[PDB]
Write a protein that binds this ligand. Structure first.
Ligand SMILES: [Mg+2]
Ligand SMILES: [Mg+2]
Ligand SMILES: [Mg+2]
Ligand SMILES: [Mg+2]
Ligand SMILES: [Mg+2]
Ligand SMILES: [Mg+2]
Ligand SMILES: [Mg+2]
Length: 39
RNA sequence: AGUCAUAGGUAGCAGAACGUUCUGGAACAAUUACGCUGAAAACAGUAACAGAAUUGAAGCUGCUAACAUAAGUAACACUAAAUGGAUAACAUGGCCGUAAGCCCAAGGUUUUGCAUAACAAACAGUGAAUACGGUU
């Protein structure tokens, strides 16, 4: 029984501010990656 | 949504994303999937939002496992020698004979016996009685 307005806040709707968190750079992950061969 | 401008790249720097495993948000595969294609790529075709990582492998004379190549190749030449339709009991021939014979020791520890395939190791076998060796 799908229902529920879009303004209800729950643990599956949360998101941080844009620019607050970044992905870690995993070095050693291929030539196309950001720090691929020598780190 | 129409005009312009830019777009070779190693070292390096910056930005955006794909995928794997697990968790939170009640439960996103009980009864499967299978029109064979889509996308710029990583890929997709059984959620999505966040998070935690032992998170991505042709490339370390790396490690493990499997499978090829060389290749049906090399090898099956230290010796006495075999033959009769059998690794024969029989016959013929040959070889050792201070050994390739016989009796023990050390060591081995059942390697020892039985079936013209077989269903047999699951079964047997080592006897101190000559003042045998040891034990003293
Ligand atoms: Mg460029
Ligand atoms: Mg140019
Ligand atoms: Mg859950
Ligand atoms: Mg690792
Ligand atoms: Mg041959
Ligand atoms: Mg014969
Ligand atoms: Mg003995």
């Amino acid at each position: 029984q799908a229902a529920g307005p879009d303004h209800l806040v729950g643990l599956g709707n949360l998101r941080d501010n844009p620019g607050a968190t970044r992905q870690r750079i995993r070095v050693g992950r291929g030539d196309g990656s950001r720090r691929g061969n020598y780190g």
